[PDB]
């Protein structure tokens, strides 16, 4: 029975600050994050037709990626059914940073029930600008 309850301006701001990289692939992002400290991250366009944006981040010698879902004016990470979401990309990331600070930011390699989760500590956005 239930019913449901500016992205451009944000992305303009994040591009101007440098940490929204626009149309780079997962492989390009891996290169950009190869020599930055663990926890570093960036936002970019997703190559998958089902999504517009992805988060790439460094942890434990690996660059990992996740897609961002955007619906009903809100944002979440993908494959998170039945979540409230956040009203901006920045709010989504800030929430995740706060979870990282508490030891609650973690990932899995499967959504099978019982899949292991692995902690990651996020730090700093990575700028696309050479200085």
């Amino acid at each position: 029975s239930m019913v449901q309850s500016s992205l451009t301006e944000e992305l303009k701001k994040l591009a101007k600050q440098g940490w929204y990289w626009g149309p780079i692939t997962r492989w390009e992002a891996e290169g950009k994050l190869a020599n930055v400290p663990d926890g570093s991250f960036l936002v970019r366009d997703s190559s998958d037709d089902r999504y517009l944006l992805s988060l790439s981040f460094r942890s434990h010698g690996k660059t990992l990626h996740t897609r961002i879902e955007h619906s009903n004016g809100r944002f979440s990470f993908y494959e998170q059914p039945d979540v409230e979401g956040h009203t901006s990309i920045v709010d989504l990331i800030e929430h995740s940073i706060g979870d990282s600070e508490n030891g609650a930011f973690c990932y899995s390699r499967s959504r099978l029930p019982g899949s292991a989760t692995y902690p990651v500590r996020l730090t700093n956005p990575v700028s696309r600008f050479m200085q």
């Binding site: 996740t66 993908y78 499967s110």
Partner: peptide, 9 residues
């Protein structure tokens, strides 16, 4: 492909 799922909190 190094894509992972963030655990919801």
């Amino acid at each position: 492909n190094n894509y992972v799922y963030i655990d919801p909190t």
